[PDB]
Design a protein around this ligand. Structure first.
Ligand SMILES: Cc1cc2nc3c(=O)[nH]c(=O)nc-3n(C[C@H](O)[C@H](O)[C@H](O)COP(=O)(O)OP(=O)(O)OC[C@H]3O[C@@H](n4cnc5c(N)ncnc54)[C@H](O)[C@@H]3O)c2cc1C
Ligand SMILES: CC1(C)c2[nH]c3cc(Cl)ccc3c2C[C@@]23CN4CCC[C@]4(C[C@@H]12)C(=O)N3
Length: 444
């Protein structure tokens, strides 16, 4: 009559989603995180309908109501050239049939953190998790606190949601493959709303944002720039994908030079108008984040089936594509659903079923996102005008954003169990069949 004891390593977006999913489905959760995750860092996170579908269930709608101010109200993407001329209005009516969110990462973390505490997730901040182990009966980790004290923590299995620099990953894949640089990076930041207000030369950016979030894209030679608003103009954010061969580290903390962005855009006719807004980014908030191409791992689940990698620990995606967080939320939902269907006496089965459901779909999104990183969409803008051909269409694919991962898992669970127990390949239908073979995805 004892609950499953879930251990979670890392409380980024995916670890918090895994904690909420597991706890709402009746399992005990003790989550560990090394940092103060409430600190204001990073810029905005987008969540598409495949993620909001999952989030809508949490607390019988409580989290969705907390996130309602952040529901995307853009009806179109406005695509501009280097003169600022509007070339194409790309309709978002289908993409936005169901809710999407756009909000500062720190606000999404806060909302998820508060709900996790409310529903009884046990959270331990200031803990670096080390040295996982497992056998046929259980798993354990070492909780290392900042005073150097070590505490053993035991559970039924370990959820490794510790991000792109996951140290848990080597417990599954001890020989790490190296991501290769795409040759591109992304400048990105929030704008300081206060100083943005009160700049008369930036007043244009507020037009209509109380009714429809701004979603402007600009294509210049060497730059793909987006300017967005959310929550009725309370927040403005921007990014700029650009060529960069420097040896940049993929972290969200390093100093970046705002003058590099000014130099890139000031030589084109629209540059001064864009800078009228972007100049109000706080200097220490400029991030220049490299767009690295990570190869799918061979698998996500450990030898005894009591550790699983999810989120960016399993399938890091660049922030340039828009499915990174949403796919990690699908990991959390499928894993928790699979655990609930398998039960405490079949934990390894649960993790292996979740891996079989998630792997090909997550890997397809990952491999397609490599093309956005390498700039395949770009053309010579002296000759071509940008249009829908140049917009990475991953956030526009119905097969991604229309998907209901929980319903899929419930309907397919016993078929996946049979594939796992009979040693047969499971052919998931949560991605297009042509895609899996076209991309060279190898089933686990
Ligand atoms: C500080 C920060 C800012 C970010 N800002 C943005 C942004 O503006 N836009 C965007 O699109 N993406 C951003 N990201 C990335 C984004 O969170 C992910 O791409 C994705 O949405 C969710 O990935 P995740 O939860 O799997 O991993 P992450 O979000 O990277 O979270 C991993 C967590 O695990 C913790 N952790 C790592 N190792 C250990 C350990 N041994 N023990 C305990 N805890 C550990 C880390 O402290 C971190 O909180 C940011 C990530 C970080 C870490
Ligand atoms: C910002 C992204 C993640 C995005 N976020 C969305 C949200 C909704 Cl709700 C609908 C569509 C999108 C898109 C499509 C975008 C628009 N950007 C223009 C330059 C680079 C990029 C990235 C990508 C692109 O090529 N396609």
């Amino acid at each position: 009559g004892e609950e499953v004891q879930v251990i979670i390593v890392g409380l980024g977006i995916v670890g918090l989603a895994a904690a909420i999913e597991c706890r709402e489905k009746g399992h005990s959760v003790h989550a560990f995180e090394k940092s103060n995750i409430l600190k204001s860092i990073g810029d905005c996170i987008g969540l598409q309908s495949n993620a909001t579908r999952i989030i809508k269930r949490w607390g019988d709608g409580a989290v969705h109501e907390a996130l309602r101010p952040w529901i995307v109200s853009s009806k179109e993407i406005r695509i501009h050239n280097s003169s600022g001329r509007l070339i194409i209005r790309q309709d978002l009516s289908e993409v936005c049939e169901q809710p999407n969110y756009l909000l500062p990462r720190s606000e999404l973390i806060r909302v998820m953190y508060e709900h996790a505490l409310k529903i009884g997730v046990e959270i331990s901040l200031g803990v670096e998790v080390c040295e996982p182990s497992e056998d046929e009966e259980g798993a354990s980790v070492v909780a290392l606190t900042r005073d150097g004290e070590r505490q053993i923590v035991r559970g039924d299995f370990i959820i490794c949601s510790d991000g792109v620099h996951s140290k848990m990953r080597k417990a599954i894949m001890p020989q790490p493959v190296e991501p290769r640089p795409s040759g591109y990076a992304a400048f990105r930041a929030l704008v300081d709303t206060e100083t943005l207000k009160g700049d008369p030369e930036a007043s244009w950016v507020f037009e209509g944002v109380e009714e429809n979030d701004r979603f402007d894209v600009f294509f210049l030679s060497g730059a793909q720039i987006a300017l967005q608003s959310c929550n009725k103009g309370k927040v403005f954010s921007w990014f700029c994908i650009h060529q960069d061969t420097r040896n940049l580290l993929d972290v969200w903390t390093s100093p970046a030079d705002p003058n590099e962005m000014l130099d890139l855009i000031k030589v084109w006719p629209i540059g001064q108008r864009l800078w009228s807004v972007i100049r109000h980014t706080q200097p220490q908030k400029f991030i220049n984040y490299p767009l690295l191409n990570h190869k799918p791992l061979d698998h996500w689940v450990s030898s005894h089936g009591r550790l699983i990698l999810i989120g960016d620990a399993a399938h890091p995606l660049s922030p340039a594509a828009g499915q990174g967080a949403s796919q990690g939320i699908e990991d959390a939902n499928v894993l928790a659903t699979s655990l609930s269907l398998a039960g405490r006496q079949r934990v390894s089965l649960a993790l292996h079923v979740a891996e079989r459901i998630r792997y090909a779909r997550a890997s397809a999104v990952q491999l397609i996102s490599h093309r956005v990183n390498e700039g395949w969409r770009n053309q010579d803008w002296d000759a071509y005008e940008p249009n829908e051909q140049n917009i990475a269409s991953l956030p526009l694919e119905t097969w991604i954003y229309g998907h209901d991962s929980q319903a899929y898992t419930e309907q397919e669970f016993e078929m996946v169990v049979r594939a796992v127990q009979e040693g047969e390949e499971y052919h998931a239908t949560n991605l297009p069949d042509k895609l899996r073979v076209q991309l060279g995805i190898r089933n686990v």
